[PDB]
């Protein structure tokens, strides 16, 4: 419906401008401060080291930035591997899920080339498995609800509301198991704050995958079940979330 | 079937293990290149500037890191949270692309971002479905004239439907995969391979963030920055349609 399509476009476009205004208002001041601090660091260094021109220091910083940008660590000079078997497994998962944290980058042209085909074939393959798991999980959840639904029906609450209450319980437990439980888990395991953990969870299950926060990249010795349980989690969560995201979509179309 | 999905799980798992083996084999030998480069930069600097200790240079590099980590940029207009870049960032959310080459630093930013996405993504998905239908219509409608030619050539109507799909994607591919990659090559001074990598990482919504095109506008070429936004919208739609139908083919299989 051409009229509706253009309305929708204008709406989103406003949803973006509105977002822009807010992120700017919330983040720019921190950013402008950091820019200031970098310049303070340069000027302080020049005053301490007369053998260095501003312009030369500039090149140093550019070069240092490029290396840090490639994942160099400021702290050390040189063991643990980002591409060990476990982390590479994880990386692949980030592709087919389309999450794409990207906290570790491919450096080789062959890596990139292979990655292209790996995804083209991997994502649809995964989408299929996901649909499957979504159906199977919803089924198991629906069967489970039935037994408690029996209790509500006896208590003479209308079948129309009992279905509604069950949804509340349905998501509330899902939420409990896939949103709340993991956030509490990650809090303790990753030394993130409550808010950081929820942020991570949600960024992840939406498949946005910023990459500022990442949980399951390497295993923890003295707690073996952690690393796989997280993978298992992403699979289930993504399925639970897919069911949700379409439905908040339905509410949105209605209004 | 539950049995079948368990089988499907195992397949994927193998697709992952197989992927792991390859990326490890391909990338592990360059794990440490960036360290090595940073160290080269330090050592080169020390040799040029005798008034600087290694340890002092160390602190400089820590302090620089902290500032870059807060969103500073090396200077020699680059604000990632000015109106234009914040717009772009919001786009990366609702599209679920999530390049993340610029991170949120504030707890308020994170909190707002949560709600912004929950509401934003489904809203965008709806617009995308809409654009997908409208674009597919335009495409399929054009193809209609060539479909008329095939039908006259007494090619079976079933193959004609197939050829049209090939065309359908192939023509899109030209406009949304090939054209942009050639565009970005020239505009971003990326290589052919880097450009395709970017395009595809983007339109799959993987959004690694190692390569990013449209975050800031380019003086001396105004149409660039919007055209890219326009491109992402169309490309994503073209790509979604492929996936839904290839998904469509797959689930019945």
């Amino acid at each position, epitope marked *: 419906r051409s009229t509706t399509l253009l309305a929708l476009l204008a709406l989103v476009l406003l949803y973006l401008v509105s977002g822009a205004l807010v992120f700017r208002a919330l983040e720019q001041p921190h950013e402008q401060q950091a820019q200031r601090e970098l310049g*303070e660091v340069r000027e302080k260094f*020049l*005053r301490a080291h*007369p053998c*260095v021109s*501003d312009q030369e220091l500039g090149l140093l910083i550019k070069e240092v930035a490029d290396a840090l940008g490639g994942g160099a660590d400021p702290e050390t000079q040189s063991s643990h591997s980002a591409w060990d078997l476990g982390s590479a497994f994880f990386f692949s998962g980030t592709i087919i899920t389309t999450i794409g944290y990207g906290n570790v980058a491919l450096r080789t042209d062959a890596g990139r080339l292979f990655c292209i085909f790996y995804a083209l074939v991997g994502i649809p393959l995964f989408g299929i498995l996901l649909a499957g798991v979504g159906d199977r999980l919803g089924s198991s959840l629906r069967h489970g609800i039935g037994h408690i639904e029996a209790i509500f029906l006896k208590w003479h609450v209308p079948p129309e509301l009992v279905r509604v209450l069950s949804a509340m319980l349905f998501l509330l437990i899902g939420c409990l198991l896939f949103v709340l439980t993991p956030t509490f888990v990650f809090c303790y395991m990753e030394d993130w704050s409550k808010l950081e953990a929820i942020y991570f969870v949600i960024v992840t299950l939406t498949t946005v995958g910023f990459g500022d926060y990442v949980a399951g990249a390497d295993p923890r010795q003295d707690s073996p079940a952690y690393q796989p349980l997280v993978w298992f989690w992403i699979l289930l969560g993504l399925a639970y979330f897919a069911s949700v995201l379409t439905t908040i979509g339905n509410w949105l179309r209605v209004v | 079937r539950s049995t079948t999905l368990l089988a499907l799980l195992a397949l994927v798992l193998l697709y992952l293990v197989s992927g792991a083996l390859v990326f490890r084999a391909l990338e592990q030998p360059h794990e440490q290149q960036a360290q090595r480069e940073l160290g080269e930069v330090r050592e080169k600097f020390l040799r*040029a500037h*005798p008034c600087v200790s290694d340890q002092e240079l160390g602190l400089l590099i820590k302090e620089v890191a902290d500032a870059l980590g807060g969103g500073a940029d090396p200077e*020699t207009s680059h604000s990632a949270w000015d109106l234009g870049s914040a717009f772009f960032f919001s786009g990366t959310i609702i599209t679920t692309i999530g390049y993340g080459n610029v991170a949120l630093r504030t707890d308020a930013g994170r909190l707002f971002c949560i709600f912004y996405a929950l509401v934003g993504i489904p809203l965008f998905g709806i617009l995308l479905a809409g654009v997908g239908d409208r674009l597919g219509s335009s495409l399929r409608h054009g193809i209609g004239h060539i479909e008329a030619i095939f039908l006259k050539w007494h090619v079976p109507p079933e193959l004609v439907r197939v050829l049209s799909a090939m065309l359908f994607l192939l023509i899109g591919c030209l406009l949304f995969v090939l054209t942009p990659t050639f565009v970005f090559c020239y505009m971003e001074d990326w290589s052919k391979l880097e450009a395709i990598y970017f395009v595809i990482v983007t339109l799959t919504t993987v959004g690694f963030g190692d390569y990013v095109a449209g975050a800031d506008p380019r003086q001396d070429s105004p149409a660039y920055q919007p055209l890219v936004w326009f491109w992402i919208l169309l490309g994503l739609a073209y790509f979604a349609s492929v996936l839904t139908t290839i998904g469509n083919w797959l689930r019945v299989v």
Partner: antibody
Amino acid sequence: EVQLQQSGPELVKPGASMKTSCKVSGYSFTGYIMNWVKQRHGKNLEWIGLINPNTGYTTYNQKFKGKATLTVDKSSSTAYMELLSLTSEDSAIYYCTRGNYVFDYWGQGTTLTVSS
Amino acid sequence: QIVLTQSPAIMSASPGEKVTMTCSASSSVSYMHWYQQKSGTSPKRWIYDTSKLASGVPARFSGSGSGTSYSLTISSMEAEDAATYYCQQWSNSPPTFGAGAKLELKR
């Protein structure tokens, strides 16, 4: 007592080029950045460029990119500036001065006259 | 290409008078420096890092400011203070100068 001693006034024909020098004493030549500055009859000061005597590194004011070449002789702790294809617009006083953030010591200046 | 404006470009003071000359920057700057020049001779670093006095300089001189606005002050004018004063910045390359403020004796 840090000191920058510049060479004497120079008189050259339009079109010619010219080289002038600045010897330092009282400190270590290679430890500090050297700059050159132009002042045209008693008016604004214009930074021309700098050289790092220790590394050979130079950067220039965009205005002077084509015009001026900075070099140094480490052994004689002397800095040089060459100016090219001179016109009467180049007639001015030119200073060498030391510093990487403030210009803390200046040569006494040298006057260039471009004339037929 | 940060631009420094000194205005007015000319001023005059009787001895004993307090003198203040300003330097406004086109965009913010962390430190300002000042040079004194007397006709016939090269500039001398006079004040640096906004408010530090160079070795030779007597106490009646002071400097202050921040961000985009900086000033040089003489608590009490003297005769030997007649000169041209220049501000300059190097918080961004390339360094730049004000066009100078010429300070003559009143009589």
